[PDB]
CSV table of C-alpha atoms and ligand atoms in Angstrom, one decimal:
chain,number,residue,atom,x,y,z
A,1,UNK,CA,1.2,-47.8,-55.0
A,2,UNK,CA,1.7,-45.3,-57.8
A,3,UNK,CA,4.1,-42.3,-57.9
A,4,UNK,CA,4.1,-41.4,-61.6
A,5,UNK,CA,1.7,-41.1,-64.6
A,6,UNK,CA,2.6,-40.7,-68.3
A,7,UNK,CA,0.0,-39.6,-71.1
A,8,UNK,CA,0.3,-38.2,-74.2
A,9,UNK,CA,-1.7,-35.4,-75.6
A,10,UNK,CA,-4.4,-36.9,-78.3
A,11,UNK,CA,-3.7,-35.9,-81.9
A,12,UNK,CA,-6.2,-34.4,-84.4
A,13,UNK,CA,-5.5,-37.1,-86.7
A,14,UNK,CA,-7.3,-38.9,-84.0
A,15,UNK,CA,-10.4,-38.3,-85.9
A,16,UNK,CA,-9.4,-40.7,-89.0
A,17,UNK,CA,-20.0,-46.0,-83.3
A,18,UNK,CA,-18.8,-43.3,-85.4
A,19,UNK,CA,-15.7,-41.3,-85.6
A,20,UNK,CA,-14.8,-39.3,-82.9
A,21,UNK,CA,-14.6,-35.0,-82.2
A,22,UNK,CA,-11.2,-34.0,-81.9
A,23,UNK,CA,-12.5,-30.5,-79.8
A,24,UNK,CA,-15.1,-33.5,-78.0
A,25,UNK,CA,-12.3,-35.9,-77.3
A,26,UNK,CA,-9.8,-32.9,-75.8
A,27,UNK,CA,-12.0,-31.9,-73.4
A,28,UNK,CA,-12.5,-35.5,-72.3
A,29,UNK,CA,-8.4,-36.2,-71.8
A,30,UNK,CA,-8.2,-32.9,-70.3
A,31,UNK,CA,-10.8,-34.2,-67.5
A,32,UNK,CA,-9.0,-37.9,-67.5
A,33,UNK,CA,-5.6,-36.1,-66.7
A,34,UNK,CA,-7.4,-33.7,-64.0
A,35,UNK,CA,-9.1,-36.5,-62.5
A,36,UNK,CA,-5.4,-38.2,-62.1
A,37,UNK,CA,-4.1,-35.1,-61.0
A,38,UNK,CA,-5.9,-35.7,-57.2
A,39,UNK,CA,-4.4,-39.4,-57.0
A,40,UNK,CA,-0.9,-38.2,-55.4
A,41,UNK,CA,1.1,-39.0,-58.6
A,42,UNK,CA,3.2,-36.4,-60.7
A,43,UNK,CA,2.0,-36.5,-64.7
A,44,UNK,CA,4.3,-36.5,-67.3
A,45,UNK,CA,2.1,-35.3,-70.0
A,46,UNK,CA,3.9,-35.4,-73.6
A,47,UNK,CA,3.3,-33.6,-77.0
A,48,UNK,CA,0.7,-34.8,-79.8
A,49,UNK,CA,2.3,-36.7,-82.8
A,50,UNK,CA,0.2,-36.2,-85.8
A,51,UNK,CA,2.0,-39.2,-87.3
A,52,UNK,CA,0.7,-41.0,-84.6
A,53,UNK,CA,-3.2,-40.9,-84.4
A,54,UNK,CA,-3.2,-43.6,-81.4
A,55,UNK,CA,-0.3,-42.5,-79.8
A,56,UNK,CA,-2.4,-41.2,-77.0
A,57,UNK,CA,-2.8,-44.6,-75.7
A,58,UNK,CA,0.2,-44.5,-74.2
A,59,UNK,CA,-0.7,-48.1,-72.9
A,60,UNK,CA,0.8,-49.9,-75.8
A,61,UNK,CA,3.8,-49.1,-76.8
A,62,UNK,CA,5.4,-49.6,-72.9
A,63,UNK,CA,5.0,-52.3,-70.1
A,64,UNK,CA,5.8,-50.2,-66.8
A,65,UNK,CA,7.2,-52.7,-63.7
A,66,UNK,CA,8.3,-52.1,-60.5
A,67,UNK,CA,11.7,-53.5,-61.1
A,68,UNK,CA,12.3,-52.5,-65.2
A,69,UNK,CA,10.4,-51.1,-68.3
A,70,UNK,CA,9.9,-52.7,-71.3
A,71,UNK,CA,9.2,-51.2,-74.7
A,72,UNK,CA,7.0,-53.5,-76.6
A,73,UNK,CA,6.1,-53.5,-80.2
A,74,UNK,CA,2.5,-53.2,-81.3
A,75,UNK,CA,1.3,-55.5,-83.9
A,76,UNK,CA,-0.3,-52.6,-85.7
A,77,UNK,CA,2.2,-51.1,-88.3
A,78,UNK,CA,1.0,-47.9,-87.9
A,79,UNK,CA,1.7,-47.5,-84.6
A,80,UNK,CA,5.1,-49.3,-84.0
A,81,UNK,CA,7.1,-46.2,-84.3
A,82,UNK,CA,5.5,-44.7,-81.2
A,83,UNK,CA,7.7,-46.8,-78.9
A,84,UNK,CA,10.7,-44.4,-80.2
A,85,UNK,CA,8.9,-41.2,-79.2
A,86,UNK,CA,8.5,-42.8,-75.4
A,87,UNK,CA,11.8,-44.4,-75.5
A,88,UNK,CA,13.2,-41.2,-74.3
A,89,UNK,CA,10.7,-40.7,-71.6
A,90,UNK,CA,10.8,-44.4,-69.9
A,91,UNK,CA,14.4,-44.3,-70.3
A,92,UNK,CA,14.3,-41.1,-68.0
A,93,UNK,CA,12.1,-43.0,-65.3
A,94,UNK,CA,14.1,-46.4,-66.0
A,95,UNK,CA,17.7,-45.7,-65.9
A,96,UNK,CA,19.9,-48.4,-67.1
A,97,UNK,CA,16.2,-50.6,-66.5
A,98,UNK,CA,15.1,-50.5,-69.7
A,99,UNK,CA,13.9,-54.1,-71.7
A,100,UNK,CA,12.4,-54.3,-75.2
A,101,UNK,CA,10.5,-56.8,-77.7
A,102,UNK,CA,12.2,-57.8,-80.7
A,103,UNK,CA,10.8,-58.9,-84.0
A,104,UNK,CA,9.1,-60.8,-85.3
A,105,UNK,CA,7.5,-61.2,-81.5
A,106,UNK,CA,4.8,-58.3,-81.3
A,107,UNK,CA,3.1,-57.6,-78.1
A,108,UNK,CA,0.8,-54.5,-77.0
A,109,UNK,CA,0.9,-53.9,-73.1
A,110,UNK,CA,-3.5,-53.3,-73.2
A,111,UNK,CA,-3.0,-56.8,-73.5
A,112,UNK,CA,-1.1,-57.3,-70.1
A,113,UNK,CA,-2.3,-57.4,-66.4
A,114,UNK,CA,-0.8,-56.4,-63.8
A,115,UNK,CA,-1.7,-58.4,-60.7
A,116,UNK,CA,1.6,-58.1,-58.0
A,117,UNK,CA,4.8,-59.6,-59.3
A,118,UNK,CA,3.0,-61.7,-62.2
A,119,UNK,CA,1.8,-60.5,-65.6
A,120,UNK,CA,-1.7,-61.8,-67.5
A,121,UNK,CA,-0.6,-61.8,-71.3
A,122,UNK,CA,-3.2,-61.8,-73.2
A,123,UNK,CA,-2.6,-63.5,-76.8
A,124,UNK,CA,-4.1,-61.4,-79.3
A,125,UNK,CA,-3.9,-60.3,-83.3
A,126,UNK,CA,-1.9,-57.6,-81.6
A,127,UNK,CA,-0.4,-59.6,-79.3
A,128,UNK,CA,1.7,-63.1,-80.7
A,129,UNK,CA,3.2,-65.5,-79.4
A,130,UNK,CA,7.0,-64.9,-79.7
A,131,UNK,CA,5.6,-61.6,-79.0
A,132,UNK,CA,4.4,-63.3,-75.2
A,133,UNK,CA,7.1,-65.4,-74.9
A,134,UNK,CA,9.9,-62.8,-74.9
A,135,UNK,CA,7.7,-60.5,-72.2
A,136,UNK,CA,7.7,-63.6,-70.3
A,137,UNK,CA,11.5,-64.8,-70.4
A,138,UNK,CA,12.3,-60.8,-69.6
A,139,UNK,CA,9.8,-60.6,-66.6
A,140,UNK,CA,11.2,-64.0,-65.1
A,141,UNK,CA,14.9,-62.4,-65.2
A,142,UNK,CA,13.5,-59.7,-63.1
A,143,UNK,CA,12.3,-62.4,-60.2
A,144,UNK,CA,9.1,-61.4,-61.9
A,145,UNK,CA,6.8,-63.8,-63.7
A,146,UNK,CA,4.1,-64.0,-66.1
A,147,UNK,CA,1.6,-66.2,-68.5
A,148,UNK,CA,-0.3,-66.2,-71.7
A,149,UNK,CA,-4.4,-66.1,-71.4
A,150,UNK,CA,-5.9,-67.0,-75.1
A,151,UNK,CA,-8.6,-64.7,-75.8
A,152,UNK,CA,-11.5,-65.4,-78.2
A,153,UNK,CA,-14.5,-63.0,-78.2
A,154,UNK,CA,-12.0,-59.9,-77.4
A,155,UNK,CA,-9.3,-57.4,-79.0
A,156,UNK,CA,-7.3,-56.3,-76.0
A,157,UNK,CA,-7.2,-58.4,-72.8
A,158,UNK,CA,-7.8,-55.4,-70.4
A,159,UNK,CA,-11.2,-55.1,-72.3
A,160,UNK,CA,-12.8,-57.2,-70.4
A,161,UNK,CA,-10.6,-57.2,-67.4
A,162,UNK,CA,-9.4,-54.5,-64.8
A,163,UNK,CA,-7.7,-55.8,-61.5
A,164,UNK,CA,-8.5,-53.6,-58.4
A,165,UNK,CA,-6.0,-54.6,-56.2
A,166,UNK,CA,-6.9,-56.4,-52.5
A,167,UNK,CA,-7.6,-59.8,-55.0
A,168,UNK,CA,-10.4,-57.8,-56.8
A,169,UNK,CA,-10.8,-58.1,-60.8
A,170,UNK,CA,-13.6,-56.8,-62.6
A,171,UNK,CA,-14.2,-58.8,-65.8
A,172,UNK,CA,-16.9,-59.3,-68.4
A,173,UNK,CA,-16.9,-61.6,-71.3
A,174,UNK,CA,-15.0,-65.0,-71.8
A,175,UNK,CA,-13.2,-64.0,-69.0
A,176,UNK,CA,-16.1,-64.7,-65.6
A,177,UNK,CA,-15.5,-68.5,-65.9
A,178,UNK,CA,-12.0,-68.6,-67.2
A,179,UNK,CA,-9.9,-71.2,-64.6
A,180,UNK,CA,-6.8,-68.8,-63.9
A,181,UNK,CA,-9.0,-66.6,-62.4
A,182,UNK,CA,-11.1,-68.5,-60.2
A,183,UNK,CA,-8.9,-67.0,-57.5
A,184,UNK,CA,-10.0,-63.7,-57.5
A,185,UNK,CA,-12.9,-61.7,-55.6
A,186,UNK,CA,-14.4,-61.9,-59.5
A,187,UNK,CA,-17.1,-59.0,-59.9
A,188,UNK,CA,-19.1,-59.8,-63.0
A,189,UNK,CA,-19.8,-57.0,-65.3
A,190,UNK,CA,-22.9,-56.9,-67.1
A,191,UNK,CA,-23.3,-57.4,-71.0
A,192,UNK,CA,-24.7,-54.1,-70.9
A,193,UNK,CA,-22.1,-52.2,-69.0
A,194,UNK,CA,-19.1,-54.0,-70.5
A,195,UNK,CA,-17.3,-51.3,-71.2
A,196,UNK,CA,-16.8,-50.3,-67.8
A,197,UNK,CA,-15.1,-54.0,-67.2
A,198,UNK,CA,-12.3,-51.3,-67.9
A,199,UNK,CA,-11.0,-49.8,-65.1
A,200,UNK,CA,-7.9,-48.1,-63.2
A,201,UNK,CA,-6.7,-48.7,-59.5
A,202,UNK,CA,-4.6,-45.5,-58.7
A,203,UNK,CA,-3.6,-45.3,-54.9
A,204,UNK,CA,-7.1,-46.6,-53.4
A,205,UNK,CA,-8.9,-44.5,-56.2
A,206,UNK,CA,-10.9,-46.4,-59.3
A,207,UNK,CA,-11.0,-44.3,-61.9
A,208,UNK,CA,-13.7,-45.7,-64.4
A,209,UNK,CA,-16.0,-44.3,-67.6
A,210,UNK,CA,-18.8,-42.0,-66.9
A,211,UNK,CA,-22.7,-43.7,-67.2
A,212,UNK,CA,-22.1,-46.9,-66.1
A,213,UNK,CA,-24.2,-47.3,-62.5
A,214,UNK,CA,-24.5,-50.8,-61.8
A,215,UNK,CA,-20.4,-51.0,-61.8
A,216,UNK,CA,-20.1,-48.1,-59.9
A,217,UNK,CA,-22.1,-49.2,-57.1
A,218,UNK,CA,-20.1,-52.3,-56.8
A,219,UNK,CA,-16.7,-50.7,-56.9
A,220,UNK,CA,-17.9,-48.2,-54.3
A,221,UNK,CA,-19.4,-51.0,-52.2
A,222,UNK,CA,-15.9,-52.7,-52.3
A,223,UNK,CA,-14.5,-49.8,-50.6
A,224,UNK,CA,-13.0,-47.4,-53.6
A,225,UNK,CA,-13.2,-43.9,-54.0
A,226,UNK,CA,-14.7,-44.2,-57.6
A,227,UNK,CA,-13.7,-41.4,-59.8
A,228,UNK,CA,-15.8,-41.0,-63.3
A,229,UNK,CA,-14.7,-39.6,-66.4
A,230,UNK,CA,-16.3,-39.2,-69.4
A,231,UNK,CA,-14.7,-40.9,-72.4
A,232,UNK,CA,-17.2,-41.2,-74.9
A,233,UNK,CA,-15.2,-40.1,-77.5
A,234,UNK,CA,-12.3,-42.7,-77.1
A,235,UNK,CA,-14.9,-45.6,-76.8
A,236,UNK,CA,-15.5,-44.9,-80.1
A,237,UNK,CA,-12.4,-46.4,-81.1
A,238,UNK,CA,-12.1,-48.8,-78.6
A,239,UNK,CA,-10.4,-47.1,-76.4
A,240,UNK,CA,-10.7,-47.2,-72.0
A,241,UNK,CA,-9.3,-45.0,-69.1
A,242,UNK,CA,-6.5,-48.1,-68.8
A,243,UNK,CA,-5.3,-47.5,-72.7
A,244,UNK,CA,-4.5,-43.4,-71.9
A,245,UNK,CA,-1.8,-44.2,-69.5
A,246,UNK,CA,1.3,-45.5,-67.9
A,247,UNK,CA,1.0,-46.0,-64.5
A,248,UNK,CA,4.2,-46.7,-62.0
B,1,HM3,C1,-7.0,-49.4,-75.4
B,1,HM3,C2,-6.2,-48.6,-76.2
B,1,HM3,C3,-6.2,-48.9,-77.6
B,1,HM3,N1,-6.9,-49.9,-78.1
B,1,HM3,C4,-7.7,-50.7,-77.3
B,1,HM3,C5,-8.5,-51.8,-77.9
B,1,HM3,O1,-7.7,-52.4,-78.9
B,1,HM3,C6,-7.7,-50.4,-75.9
């Protein structure tokens, strides 16, 4: 289980299915972080950046283990620096634990899994793969392991893809028939709900986006204390309850 959270306050250059409210999209994180705040984990909540519109999805620029951290390096230039505003932070948490990505290799951790000891990498535009390769070859030092899943229809891997814990993944997409998963209690999420394919374990609790019944029913049927937020504002961008946080 989880002990500590890490989020970062959005930024009003956020704003730059539409384009989302900075006062709308507050509100929303301000619920996200209470809703975490009942899962028995301490938040470290940090600052805005304003030269750092993303930089609330903390997801990306750091891959949180139970043995070591490691600082990627997103393939988008604009937000590569924000792994040296969380440097600090992981480093605190991470003592004489911390790993990094070197160029050329990019990688994005929305485009890992976590599933026990071994790590889904997702090969994206984000994501390449000396980018992939180096996250492996760093997990496998730390008796740790990972592969690479090619993606097609799909920007981040944990788009489509949310593992629950007890062998349970949600996933939508390419992913339903894909043969490294065929393992797994696999809950199909519907076309229409998709965007609830993203989801959070936290200590027994799911925390998922608000309006999506059919999922919701089948996480709570699976024995979850589902937890909704509403995110609207962030799925404008893209953006899931997974992306806004480090979990560890
Ligand atoms: C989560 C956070 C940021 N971006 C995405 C999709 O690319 C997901």
């Amino acid at each position: 289980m989880f002990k500590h959270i890490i989020a970062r306050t959005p930024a009003r250059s956020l704003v730059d299915l539409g384009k989302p409210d900075y006062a709308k999209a507050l509100e929303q994180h301000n619920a996200y972080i209470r809703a975490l705040q009942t899962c028995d984990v301490d938040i470290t909540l940090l600052p805005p950046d304003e030269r750092f519109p993303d930089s609330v999805f903390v997801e990306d620029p750091v891959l949180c283990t139970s043995r070591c951290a490691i600082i990627t390096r997103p393939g988008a230039e604009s937000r590569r620096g924000e792994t040296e505003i969380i440097e600090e932070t992981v480093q605190r948490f991470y003592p004489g634990k911390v790993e990094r990505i070197e160029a050329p290799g990019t990688v994005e951790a929305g485009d890992i899994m976590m599933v026990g000891d071994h790590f889904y990498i997702g090969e994206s535009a984000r994501t390449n793969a000396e980018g992939a390769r180096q996250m492996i070859a760093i997990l496998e030092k730390h008796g740790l392991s990972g592969s690479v899943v090619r993606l097609e229809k799909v920007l981040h891997l944990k788009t489509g893809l949310a593992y629950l814990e007890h062998n349970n993944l949600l996933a939508a997409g390419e992913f339903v028939s894909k043969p490294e998963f065929q393992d797994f209690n696999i809950i199909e999420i519907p076309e229409e709900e998709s965007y609830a394919a993203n989801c959070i374990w936290v200590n027994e609790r799911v925390i998922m986006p608000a309006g999506y019944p059919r999922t919701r029913e089948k996480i709570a049927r699976l024995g979850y204390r589902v937890i909704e937020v509403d995110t609207s504002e962030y799925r404008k961008i893209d953006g899931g309850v997974s992306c806004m946080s480090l979990r560890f």
